[model samples]
Target: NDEDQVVVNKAAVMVHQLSKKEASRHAIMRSPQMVSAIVRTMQNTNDVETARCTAGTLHNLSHHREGLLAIFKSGGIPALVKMLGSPVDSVLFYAITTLHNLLLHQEGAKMAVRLAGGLQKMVALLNKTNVKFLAITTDCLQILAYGNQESKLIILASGGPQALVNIMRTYTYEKLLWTTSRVLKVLSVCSSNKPAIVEAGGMQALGLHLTDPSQRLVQNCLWTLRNLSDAATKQEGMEGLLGTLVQLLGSDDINVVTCAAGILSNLTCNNYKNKMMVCQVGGIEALVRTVLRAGDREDITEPAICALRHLTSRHQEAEMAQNAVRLHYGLPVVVKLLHPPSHWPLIKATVGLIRNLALCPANHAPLREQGAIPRLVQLLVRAHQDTQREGVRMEEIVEGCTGALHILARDVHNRIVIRGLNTIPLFVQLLYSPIENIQRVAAGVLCELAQDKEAAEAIEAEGATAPLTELLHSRNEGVATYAAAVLFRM
Candidate 1:
């Protein structure tokens, strides 16, 4: 062993010298004998100093192609990750940073990071290691936890959520804060992970940073808030999260404004007090301003409309929120979202708010004034034409479209507008759709429009006779009664 120890000491010296510059790094990997010597020492070295030097060379090796390929080809990743157990901070630092560099490529690096307990070790680094290594360790977790659910589950099930939120408050460097927020933002994607993040004071840390003068930091924090809120306001309240979000609605960066609006959208969902809380903070006018500022960027318009949709839906605040929406020309902005035959989600949200806007009798003339009829009619008819190709999401859009039409038809003149679109045949055809709810809403709207003589004749003229007559005794009592009433009145 002493005799071979000569080359081991020589290999450590050569790697140390090679680790210093790109030319030497290239030279060392070129000699298969040199790379073999390095890998053997990398794989078998037991002394801490030798391990540290091999790790530093490997960290440098990961930077170039042949060197990295040689390392992985030499069964070096597990060996590299193995040194992570060394109690020395320098050893752990080089070990994890080398993995960070390798993780940037090669799909199997992810598996190695997982199976070798590298993930738990990285979390432990954050939880217990020296604060000096915080930035690199966080960058590791950021890559490991992003987008892949299995990686995320390991991180979350370990101390990932709590550990991430803890450093998030203590660290202030640009690199660490930015990278740590990236980690927490992805961690918040899993719904089950939310409570852990919350319990860790994730929002409290995020809210304080949302106002950073650096737009990138503020933007990252805003995105984390939006994702975290995708599921509170009590913990969120003293932080003044609502008012700041409303203020961020005016940000010059479209992403900042978009996420700010989305945060409001999530915060207000099914939340009565926060819905009114949003309104009380003057969010109504700011969200209206966001839509007013939007152009072709659905990124900007969709979430703002979604926020408005939540702020005004089926709640006591609907009247005031809707009134404010009208005063700021928000109603026209909302109706315009229906213009393009666009993605289902945008239309679903657009028409959903339009449905809420129509709930108040006062907004009817403004809605018709904005010309919401023709676009809505075409959207529903086309939506039904693709029923077999659709999913449950399609059903939400159908209900939104039909419900808006149902309420809009209550106005005598708006009913005239709906009838003039020559869309009654589409509704008559929908009575035969496979989705029972489609049949019911179609029957419901037709039942309402039946009171007007022009629509009543159009319903019959579309040959509503067969479906309506058959639907009279259909399973949904409302559908049958609605059709029976439509046929009787006809």
Candidate 2:
């Protein structure tokens, strides 16, 4: 018993030491010897806590290229690959996580294709493993693409392209649906590189799933279509994806509208023809209506905001024209979210709306004039850390806070608030959060804020880029992919 305790204490001290140093990228990476030693301890100890620690350390180290390559070379890759097939689900997650990190870079991606036996292997696991593995592996394909163009093509040639379409058609579980959607988002790029998407039957598959009554499927379909439409831009492959995404704008689910908006953003470039297509499907108008109605509800509205910004363009005239077309009565509901009770979900939705509105230069002054800045700043400030705060649903609150921070970073005035309040450093600390979703949401917010020259200087001042870049190279494909998008803008 003392031995286990001693081992944990030593491991804890090592972790603390590592954090204190916040060492150089080279320093962060060279610790794989520790990983190798820990993995060896796991083999003989039969200690669950120790196993968890080793798994976690492996996860931490593998978040970047050099560390990941070391672990892979140290036999971490094959070990993880084997563990993925283990009977214990936790162990499986640990293994997939390691592989996820390894495949995050170009070299890692190539190795994942070769070592993991390609897309066929990932597909086979879909039927064999539980939802957990399903989610992680789907994310892996996503990270591989974030690595290099060649890595993406490797995934396509490895039967990844067809496997993704097949997964969508066959997988019905709600969680799996989301994962499949993430994977499709990556392959959409593949389709664009070659005109092979037509042969892949991507549009038909997307159409079928988009119309499926499942809420998660609909959202995933929308997100997937967003990626497809982005890739198909030069070719203007808006017809098929546009139809399915637009139909969802009027759904009772605000998430559906939000998702539809994001996809529409990709399709509705500067072309009047495209915007008209969105209008025909009731795009811009439908989104505004949903925002009007979403004030009371939290589940749907935040997503609606994400969608709106995604659908709009960088043009001032186009954005202003879209802004003037507002849902008149929605302002009060948004204001209510920031008042006394400070309903977090409602506040999150409100911030999301503000973020999209901020996209149009005109809305910036109006948003500040309306006093959205102080409330939004307060919301982000309140959401700064995810300590073990006292609450019935603290975990959920932590997630909502990160989501709020994401939008806050984009609001010009709100960025000033964050700066004055000295929240950037605290926000940057969260980039290393142990919780996957929190890490992702926090990374996204940091990345958004980093876009502001002032915010970027502040974030870089706080030493945020390394962690952000590490997240971009993350093994958790979901985290890796979102981080990549954020890092790309940075």
Model 1 C-alpha lDDT per residue in residues 157-201, reported as the tens digit of each score: 887888888887776676777888888888887776777788788
Best by lDDT: 1
lDDT of 2 by residue, 1-490 (tens): 1122334546533552452344643564675555566456544455555555566666667666677776766766655555554555576576677777666552644554555554445544555446666777887766656646766666666666666676666666666667777667665656543345435665556767777767666666666665665535344455666676666667776566666665565555545566555555656566667767655454455455444544454443446434644444334444455665545545554454555555555555555566665565455556543353433244445555556546545666766765676767766777787788778777777766767777777777787768878887677777787676655655
Q: List the candidates' TM-scores in order.
A: 0.73, 0.35
Query: Largest TM-score belongs to which candidate?
Result: 1
- The local distance difference test score of each candidate is 0.78, 0.60
TM-score of 1: 0.73
Model 2: residues >4 Å from true position, as ranges?
Answer: 1-73, 82-94, 101-129, 191-200, 208-220, 226-246, 249-490
